[PDB]
Ligand binder design. Structure first.
Ligand SMILES: Nc1ncnc2c1ncn2[C@@H]1O[C@H](CSCC[C@H](N)C(=O)O)[C@@H](O)[C@H]1O
Lengths: 17, 199, 114, 55, 408
């Protein structure tokens, strides 16, 4: 039944602008 | 863009790409400063030549520094540029950096399936099978479907190394994706099961 | 074929012989919950094995309770929410968790008596 | 007969609830009184390591 | 306040199916000069799973086993009927369309069969775009000797089958099916253009079938379809399912992929139509000049593996260009801009050399199609085919020009 078959880059690297 | 600007960019990008293919990261840096002197703004394909030049000379730190220059200049790295860094990280066994770059490509809204396939094969080729399994399972459990060639590669290499636990995890994910196991895959698992002493 | 464009509209040009007091019954069907009974049979027509369907529904219901604990156990039951969601995923429309209430209740404290 | 009916429906988790283990732990001790040991082993399908369950 | 503020198909078209358990959800059948179609009658919102668009009961279909022996599902041919001997005398590989045509003509003769009614909504002999109905003058407008010879062999095979099996001595119950060759040719044309081949489970038997499915043979083809077919074994219903998570707007046409991975010449041979945005069309290049595959894909935002290219100007023709253009790749070696311009220039010259092979151009063919007043359906189909190929070659020249400039 139901028991069958076992049931961060790109940050701090931006343009200074 | 005027005709004069296009003429200069062609000869500047000719010199730059002839030194990236020459495996001369120092020369590729000189041309970028020549572009700055002329007033030309280095685009994504100019920093791609700088990344490739470092990447070809097995230089992970310079290539990562070149990526920071590209991001610091406000340019958007090309999908091929990230793949060159991802493949370089795998060749050195740096799975953590390879996964950081894959996260960046997802953030950049690129398609990381092809770059993830490349990262796993580099780790397997460079005898980093333990790291390759960690990267492969994270992608497979994340929903990405690998190639049939890579599925047969991961199962077979794990069973040659006596790693039945990873080979069984992958084969379960292979069928969950929609690729049913065949006699070849079962024979790989049986090669390890036959030596456990429990028939 | 192409004529200018004017074209021949296709019609049956042949004879097909195959071509009101249930309000109380319809309202009682909804009251007793027979609508979900038909929905369950509808979902099982798309399932190869009914035992894995039961397991999948229970697995999805467990995820609902972990996500939002306080919203289930009273008027909204997690298993009923799963079944209504899966009917809506097919593109049909059902109320959420099949929950309905009596609009003619004479205020608080009054229980409808069977 | 109630167990058989539940098994016929295939409601494995309902049957587990209505049975629950103290019934089996007490069985082991009574078998131990006859100089018999009843050990429950789990063999991992991943690394083939045998685990003796605490019974 | 509310006070201060393509024709629909014959209503009996859906009704004859509807009284026989055909259900359509959120779509309507609309008819135009180019034929029937299925369009979203409202905004079909995305869901977590595929939405059911249409349900077609099995008993309204005409199906035959793809592989020998020939069994019909549902079984409509009586035991001992001479039509089975005609079906059984066919080539198992090539004559699948002849077998379906015999079943189709037989079905029209049965009083109770659904296709007696549904057959009146099938395109007529002068309205079907199949090249089996094309005259020798219509084939002269293809400008493709390989396709023309393929069609002539198809017409020869179909005609010889009728002459062999519908001679003077056959019983009347056979004669009345195909009284003339054109009637049988039309049936084969319907069989080729409308057959849907699927793997189905009926009861406990799993088998491949060639199926004539009403209301699903009204879905048009797209290489980027918003719908797909799904057999529901438990109640023997074919489901038309919209792609999971894909929003479909009101009036948008509902489409399926007839032939994944097939070129326009294959679409012309089978269904008698072609598309200018076929992502599998190929062009014969010499290979002397090659462009950088990685650069070309990234310039146009074409991602995925070569067999699963997709776009994140760019359409199926640019994807086809990526697969058919001569390309080089050296892992991560970058391309020299001045060497790539020589290749792009030489590839464009070879593209113009092939456009100069056609006596007319793409826009001259387009204006010819607008000027037609008494043209056969296959004639316009033949012109659209050669025009689409010209549009594809012209798209490559534009794509190469864009690629050459975006490489700076
Ligand atoms: N994308 C497409 N472009 C042009 N014609 C198409 C098409 N998809 C399907 N067709 C046409 O539709 C036929 C398939 S049957 C599809 C319904 C058909 N339009 C009808 O009215 O009966 C083919 O013969 C082809 O001519």
């Amino acid at each position: 039944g139901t028991g069958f078959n076992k049931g961060d880059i790109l940050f701090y690297h931006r343009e200074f602008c | 863009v005027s005709a004069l600007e296009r003429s200069l960019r062609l000869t500047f990008m000719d010199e730059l790409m002839e030194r990236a293919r020459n495996r001369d990261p120092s020369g590729v840096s000189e041309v970028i400063y020549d572009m700055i002197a002329a007033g030309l703004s280095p685009g994504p394909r100019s920093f791609h030549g700088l990344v490739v030049a470092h990447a070809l000379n097995g230089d992970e730190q310079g290539a990562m520094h070149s990526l920071r220059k590209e991001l610091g200049a406000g340019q958007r790295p090309l999908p091929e540029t990230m793949i060159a860094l991802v493949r370089l990280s795998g060749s050195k066994g740096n799975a953590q950096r390879g996964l950081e770059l894959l996260a960046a490509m997802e953030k950049l809204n690129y398609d990381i399936r092809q770059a993830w396939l490349i990262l796993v094969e580099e780790l397997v080729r460079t005898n980093h099978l333990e790291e390759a399994n960690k990267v492969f399972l994270k992608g497979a459990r994340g929903g990405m479907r690998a190639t049939d060639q890579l599925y047969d590669l991961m199962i077979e290499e794990d069973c040659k190394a006596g790693d039945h636990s990873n080979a069984l995890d992958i084969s379960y994910e292979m069928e969950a994706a929609g690729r049913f196991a065949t006699t070849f895959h079962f024979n790989c698992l049986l090669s390890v099961q036959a030596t456990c002493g429990i028939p | 074929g192409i004529q200018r464009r004017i074209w021949r509209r296709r019609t049956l040009t042949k004879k097909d012989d195959m071509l009101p007091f249930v309000e109380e019954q319809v309202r009682k069907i909804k009251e007793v919950g027979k609508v979900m009974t038909m929905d369950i049979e509808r979902l099982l027509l798309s399932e190869d094995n009914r035992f894995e369907f039961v397991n999948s529904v229970a697995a999805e219901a467990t995820e609902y309770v972990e996500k939002n604990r306080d919203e289930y156990g009273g008027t909204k039951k997690a298993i009923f929410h799963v079944l209504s969601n899966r009917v809506n995923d097919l593109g049909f429309d059902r109320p959420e968790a099949y929950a309905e209430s009596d609009p003619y209740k004479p205020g608080p404290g009054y229980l409808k008596e069977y | 007969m109630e167990v058989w009916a539940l098994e016929g429906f295939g409601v494995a988790h309902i049957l587990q609830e209505m049975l629950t283990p103290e019934s089996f732990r007490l069985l082991v001790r009574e078998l131990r009184s006859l100089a018999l040991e009843l050990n429950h082993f789990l063999v991992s399908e991943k690394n083939f390591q045998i685990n003796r369950k605490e019974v | 306040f509310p006070l201060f503020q393509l024709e629909s198909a014959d209503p009996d078209f859906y009704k004859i199916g509807y009284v026989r358990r055909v259900r359509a959800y959120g779509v309507e059948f609309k008819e135009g000069p180019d034929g029937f179609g299925i369009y979203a009658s409202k905004d079909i919102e995305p869901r977590r799973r595929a939405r059911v668009i249409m349900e077609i009961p099995h008993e309204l279909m005409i199906t035959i086993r793809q592989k020998h022996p020939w069994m019909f599902f549902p079984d409509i041919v009586p035991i001992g009927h001479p039509i089975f001997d005609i079906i059984n005398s066919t080539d198992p590989e090539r004559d699948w369309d002849l077998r379906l045509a015999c079943l189709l003509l037989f079905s029209f003769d049965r009083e109770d069969h659904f296709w007696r009614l549904y057959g009146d909504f099938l395109p007529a002999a002068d309205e079907c775009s199949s090249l089996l109905l094309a005259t020798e003058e219509d084939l002269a407008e293809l400008q493709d000797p390989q396709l023309v010879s393929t069609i002539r062999q198809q017409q020869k095979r179909v005609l010889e089958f009728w002459e062999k099996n519908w001679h003077s001595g056959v019983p009347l119950k056979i004669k009345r099916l195909a009284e003339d060759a054109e009637r049988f040719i039309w049936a084969v044309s319907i069989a080729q253009t409308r057959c849907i081949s699927m793997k189905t489970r009926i009861g406990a038997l799993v088998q491949d079938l060639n199926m004539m499915i009403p209301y699903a043979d009204m879905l048009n083809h797209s290489f980027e379809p918003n719908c797909f077919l799904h057999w529901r074994p438990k109640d023997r219903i074919l489901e038309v399912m919209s792609n999971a998570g894909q929003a479909i707007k009101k009036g948008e046409e509902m489409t399926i992929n007839y032939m994944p991975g097939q070129k326009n010449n294959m679409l012309m041979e089978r269904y008698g139509f072609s598309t200018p945005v076929n992502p599998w069309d190929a062009i014969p290049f010499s290979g002397d000049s090659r462009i950088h595959l990685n650069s070309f894909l990234s310039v146009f935002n074409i991602f995925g593996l070569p067999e699963e290219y997709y776009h994140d100007f760019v359409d199926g023709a640019v994807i086809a260009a990526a697969r058919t253009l001569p390309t080089w790749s050296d892992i991560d070696l970058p391309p020299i801009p001045s060497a790539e311009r020589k290749a792009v220039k030489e590839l464009q010259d070879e593209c113009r050399k092939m456009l100069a092979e056609y006596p007319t151009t793409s826009e001259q063919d387009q204006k010819l199609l607008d000027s037609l007043s008494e043209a056969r359906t296959t004639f316009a189909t033949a012109v659209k085919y050669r025009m689409h190929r010209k549009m594809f070659i012209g798209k490559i020249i534009k794509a190469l020009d864009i690629y050459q400039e975006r490489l700076l």
